[PDB]
Paper text:
In contrast, a group of bacteriophages belonging to families Siphoviridae and Podoviridae has abandoned the usage of one of them, adenine (A), replacing it with 2-aminoadenine (Z). Recently, two classes of replicative proteins found in ZTGC-DNA-containing phages were characterized and one of them, [name] from DNA polymerase A (PolA) family, was shown to possess significant Z-vs-A specificity. The enzyme exhibits the typical fold of the PolA family, with easily identifiable polymerase (pol) and 3′-5′ exonuclease (exo) domains.
Here, we present the crystallographic structure of the apo form of [name] of vibriophage ϕ[name], composed of the 3′-5′ exonuclease and polymerase domains. Through extensive screening and optimization, we could eventually obtain single crystals that diffracted to 2.8 Å. The two molecules contained in the asymmetric unit of the [name] crystal represent different conformations. The transition between the two forms of the molecule involves mainly two subdomains moving mostly as rigid-bodies: the thumb subdomain known to hold the nascent double-stranded DNA and an extension in the exonuclease domain, present in a reduced form in only a few other PolA structures (see below). Thus, the two [name] conformations are hereafter referred to as the ‘thumb-exo’ open and ‘thumb-exo’ closed states. The three insertions conserved in the ϕ[name]-like [name] subfamily take the form of external loops of several to about twenty residues, scattered around the polymerase domain's active site. Interestingly, although their side-chains are unstructured in the absence of this leaving nucleotide, in the closed state these residues are much closer to the core of the exonuclease domain, assuming a particular conformation which blocks the active site from accepting a nucleotide.
Author numbering: -1 to 479, 487 to 629
């Protein structure tokens, strides 16, 4: 069906062939489940660039691990998996040592090539699209697994005849069936990797593709190491969250005037006062609600966040703390822990919000980035559950004012004063440095008082003049066009005065949006391509550049820390702009090496790593 190889003629029967005769080959594991350090590999499959492919049940045929180890020890070429982290770790636990610097990831390559596989544009047709192998193979090589195996599986086990339903069953099926399932997987993976070479070659993505490949071993190593936990405390924390939830509930019933079930869509419509008029749905705080497909007024999380109603923040707070007690604590740290540690997965390309279009990484199971930062009470309940390595101390540090320095550096191209200001005072606070020039304060003391922080943050998130006015408490009002926030007379004066005292901020926004509209994309200095199909949301161009450049330099941090610790320690984790490390008891020499290895002046403004504290666990290092 228009493919390089014809796998049905040549494949599915490969044996202990010689793999050194290839520059690339495919690899795919089948495991008893998904839990690292618990489930084990039960078989695997490999495809070769000359039409061969094979599957081996390691239980029935243990001669194939010996051949594998033999093939892999001299092998100098590229190994391809779709999920390099999963395949390499499940193998490692099962005693299959692959050379990690030689593994490649079809899904990370897919993100470098188009970050919007799941983005819903105003013109899309169907369901989302994603980074699964089935979907990327269909879209890029036009290939697809035959549905006959899923039917055979369902006839054996029961459920829907789908990959999602039948994967948990594969180690229970006869190996000739898993051979029909697993061989095309390695075939489609190698054909995907082959077609990505062309697209990466034709589109000049060699730099960002190489960068993420350089990053990958440092995250799989970290992923495989895990974080040590204190489970005896963790059970105590679930009793503390109990009280925190009971309070969240009381505060929420108070704001509604009654008790109710936040899980009943009807009662949540009642407490927020959702009324319809002339085709429009409003909630009691005046917010205009969109409709659900079912025609109901939509009160999802995106809508709650857009309200000023305190009841919205209360609902979201209660949902969040329930998820922290039940999913974060009970399930991921207490239940699924293994020998006193937890092993979350690190998504190298998907950020904390599920967005793919920025270099951001993010944890799952437990989601360590989802411990709050503006509620020190919750962090103080959770963070004592996380421990350094046995014998070591917990060192916490912070990239100070990270995303603002990235901003300063991009606009520093069009303003040498910003570069010189940070040169004299490397610890300069950009907000205070702008307030000190406009004659306005860094922060608000009174409502309606203009401040530098809110100004600076409205340039960072490309924000219209009314959005800026609103964040300041300055007069504004709604207007048709269809609906938008029109800035008042007093707000357009400070925004204009802002762009006169701070030259270059407007040039950042405009050149970024322009190039996004002409050429179709812009790029970080590491070469991450940020794409704006049909100029969609192109006015956001400069802000997204900041998130991406700051995510580039964050992956640059892991590389530099992991190297600087060496044998003296290990990076525990990274949340937001913070970096935790397990270090030896003589910690000051180790810390000063990490600090000089990370702190750099290779951008237009310095990057600083500021010490945060040391302790016997995560909370104590932070001072809680």
């Amino acid at each position: 069906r228009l493919m390089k190889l014809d796998w049905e003629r040549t494949g599915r029967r490969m044996g202990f062939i010689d793999l050194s005769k290839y520059e690339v080959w495919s690899y795919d594991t089948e495991c008893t489940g998904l839990q690292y350090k618990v489930d084990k590999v039960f078989g695997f499959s490999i495809a070769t660039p000359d039409g061969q492919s094979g599957y081996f049940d390691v239980r029935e045929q243990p001669e194939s691990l010996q051949w594998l180890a033999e093939q892999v020890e001299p092998y100098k070429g590229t190994i391809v998996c779709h999920n390099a982290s999963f395949d390499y770790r499940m193998s490692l636990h099962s005693g299959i040592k692959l050379p990690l610097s030689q593994i490649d990831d079809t899904g990370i390559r897919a993100c470098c090539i188009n970050e919007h596989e799941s983005t819903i544009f105003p013109w899309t047709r169907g369901r989302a699209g994603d980074y699964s192998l089935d979907y990327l193979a269909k879209k890029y090589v036009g290939a697809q697994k035959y549905a006959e195996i899923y039917d055979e599986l369902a006839a054996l086990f029961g459920g829907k005849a789908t990959r999602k339903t039948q994967m948990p069953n594969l180690y229970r099926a006869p190996s000739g069936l898993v051979r029909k399932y697993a061989c095309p997987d390695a075939e489609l993976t190698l054909e995907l990797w082959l077609e990505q070479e062309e697209l990466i070659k034709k589109r000049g993505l060699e730099r960002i593709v190489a960068f993420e490949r350089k990053v990958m071993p440092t995250l799989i190593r970290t992923e495989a190491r895990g974080v040590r936990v204190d489970l005896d405390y963790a059970e105590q924390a679930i009793f503390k969250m109990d009280g925190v939830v009971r309070e969240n509930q009381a505060k929420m019933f108070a704001l509604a005037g009654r008790e109710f079930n936040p899980n009943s869509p009807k009662q949540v419509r009642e407490v927020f006062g959702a009324k319809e008029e002339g085709g429009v749905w409003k909630s009691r705080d005046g917010t205009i609600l969109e409709r659900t497909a079912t025609g109901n007024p939509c009160l999802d999380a995106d809508a709650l966040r857009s309200m000023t109603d305190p009841l919205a923040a209360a609902v979201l707070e209660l949902r969040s703390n329930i998820k922290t007690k039940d999913t974060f604590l009970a399930k991921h740290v207490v239940e699924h822990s293994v020998g006193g540690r937890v092993y979350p997965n690190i998504n190298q390309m998907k950020g904390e919000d599920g967005g793919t279009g920025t270099g951001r990484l993010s944890y799952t199971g437990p989601a360590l980035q989802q411990i709050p930062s503006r509620n020190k009470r919750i962090a103080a309940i959770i963070k004592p559950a996380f421990l350094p390595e046995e014998g070591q101390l917990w060192l916490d540090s912070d990239m100070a004012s990270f995303e603002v320095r990235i901003f300063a550096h991009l606009v520093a191209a069009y303003n040498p004063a910003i570069a010189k200001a940070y040169a004299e005072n490397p610890e300069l606070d950009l907000h205070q440095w702008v307030g000190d020039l406009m004659g306005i304060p860094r922060n608000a003391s009174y409502s309606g008082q203009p401040n530098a922080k809110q100004m600076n943050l409205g340039m960072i998130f490309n924000r219209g003049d009314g959005a800026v006015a609103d964040s300041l408490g300055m007069p504004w009002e709604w207007c048709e066009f269809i609906r938008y926030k029109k800035a008042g007379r007093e707000a357009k004066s400070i925004i204009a005065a802002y762009h006169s005292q701070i030259q270059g901020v407007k040039t950042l926004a405009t050149r970024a949006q322009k190039i996004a509209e002409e050429r179709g994309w812009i790029q970080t200095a590491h070469g991450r391509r940020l794409r704006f199909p049909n100029g969609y949301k192109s006015y956001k161009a400069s802000g997204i550049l900041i998130q991406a450049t700051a995510a580039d330099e964050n992956k640059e941090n892991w590389l530099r820390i992991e190297d600087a610790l060496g044998s003296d320690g290990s990076m525990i984790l990274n949340t937001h702009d913070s970096y935790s490390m397990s270090v030896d008891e003589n910690w000051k020499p180790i810390w000063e090496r990490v600090k000089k290895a990370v702190e750099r002046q290779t951008l237009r403004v310095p990057l600083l790593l500021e010490f945060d504290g040391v302790g016997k666990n995560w909370a104590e290092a932070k001072g809680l």
